[PDB]
């Protein structure tokens, strides 16, 4: 007997309204659970609309200050050979090591960007990193 108008209100709304009307003889099994623990959003039907004007998708891109260092390192040395073991969550690559050394070098007090980059390369070379150059 439940109303089959899925485009009008939610399942909870329709069931509650029909019960209040008395058309529904008794509340269905899940009604009490839904009432006790409603979802964050009422499952009301809603037709998607395509943005037309200057309105934009509010999804912001993801970046970090270290993305600059990563991009420059990739440009100067490429991907090298330390292939990404994406399964290890604690995995750190050569680019990650360069980023860390760049960050600590900046924290030292040195502020020039190009000097930070070159000195980071030299410091990792001293550490033993094979910073093979792409070109």
């Amino acid at each position: 007997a439940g109303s089959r108008l899925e485009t009008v209100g939610s399942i909870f709304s329709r069931t509650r309204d029909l019960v209040r009307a008395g058309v529904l003889k008794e509340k269905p099994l899940w009604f009490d659970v839904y009432d006790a623990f409603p979802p964050l959003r009422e499952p009301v039907f809603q037709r998607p609309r395509v943005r037309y004007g200057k309105a934009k998708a509010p999804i912001q891109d993801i970046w970090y200050h270290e993305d600059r260092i990563r991009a420059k390192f990739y440009s100067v040395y490429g991907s090298g050979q330390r292939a990404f073991d994406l399964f290890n969550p604690n995995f750190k690559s050569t680019c990650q090591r360069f980023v860390e050394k760049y960050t600590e070098l900046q924290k030292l007090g040195e502020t020039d960007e190009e000097k930070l980059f070159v000195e980071t390369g030299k410091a990792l070379l001293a550490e033993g990193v094979i910073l093979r150059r792409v070109g």
Partner: protein
């Protein structure tokens, strides 16, 4: 019987998490399972914007905080239905995971329908099955998109019949009609296995707690 029904059914509703589902997963575990990897930004569906954390190189990232909250709610609701002995039906048309979903359903006792969905299996359930057939009290859409990247007809049919639907909605899904959406990744085998394990554990815990409480009531 009134005392029985009260003390059994209504007691769990008192506590926010009677089945202690929150311990079944952690944001770290979801991240390891890759629940947070969505489709490309171009494939994004407008209504998933609130759940999308952001875009990384034109790849959507699902906000695992929102996913954790939604999964808490969905697992809690599923456990409550299992405890109330409702019929839970797992639906998904991903042939890659059809076998896993069927086995998980068999193991947890609840039912599954992963094959082709004949028209009206819910709307015309009485004629397709019989007048006395009992319809599912809860549905779980492990995949809400049919093989043609369209919302599974079961979603709309469940909305029509007023059967609550938990559903793993991807960044290109349409969560408008899913009662309990769980924004996440539906394509990673690790993510799907995590979902299946979580639901199986929730159902098993709900049923065992139901049996334990029934025995406690009856012994006294």
């Amino acid at each position: 019987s009134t005392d029985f029904n009260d003390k059994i059914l209504n007691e769990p509703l008192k506590h926010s998490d009677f089945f202690n589902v929150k311990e079944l997963f952690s944001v770290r575990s979801l991240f390891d399972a890759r629940v947070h990897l969505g489709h490309k930004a171009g494939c994004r569906h407008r209504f998933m914007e609130p759940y999308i954390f952001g875009s990384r190189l034109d790849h959507d990232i699902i906000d695992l905080e929102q996913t954790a909250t939604h999964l808490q709610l969905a697992l809690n609701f599923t456990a409550h239905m299992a405890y109330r002995k409702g019929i839970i039906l797992f639906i998904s048309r991903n042939r890659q995971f059809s076998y896993l979903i069927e086995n998980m359903a068999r193991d947890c006792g609840e039912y599954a329908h992963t094959r082709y969905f004949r028209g009206g299996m819910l709307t015309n359930a009485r004629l397709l099955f019989g007048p006395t057939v009992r319809l599912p009290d809860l549905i779980i859409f492990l995949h809400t998109l049919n093989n043609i990247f369209e919302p599974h007809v079961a979603v709309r049919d469940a909305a029509k019949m007023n059967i609550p639907t938990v559903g793993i909605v991807d960044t290109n899904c349409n969560p408008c009609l899913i009662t309990y959406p769980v924004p996440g990744n539906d394509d990673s085998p690790l993510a799907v296995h995590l979902y299946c394990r979580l639901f199986q554990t929730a159902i098993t815990r709900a049923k065992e707690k139901r049996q334990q409480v029934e025995a406690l009531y009856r012994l006294q």
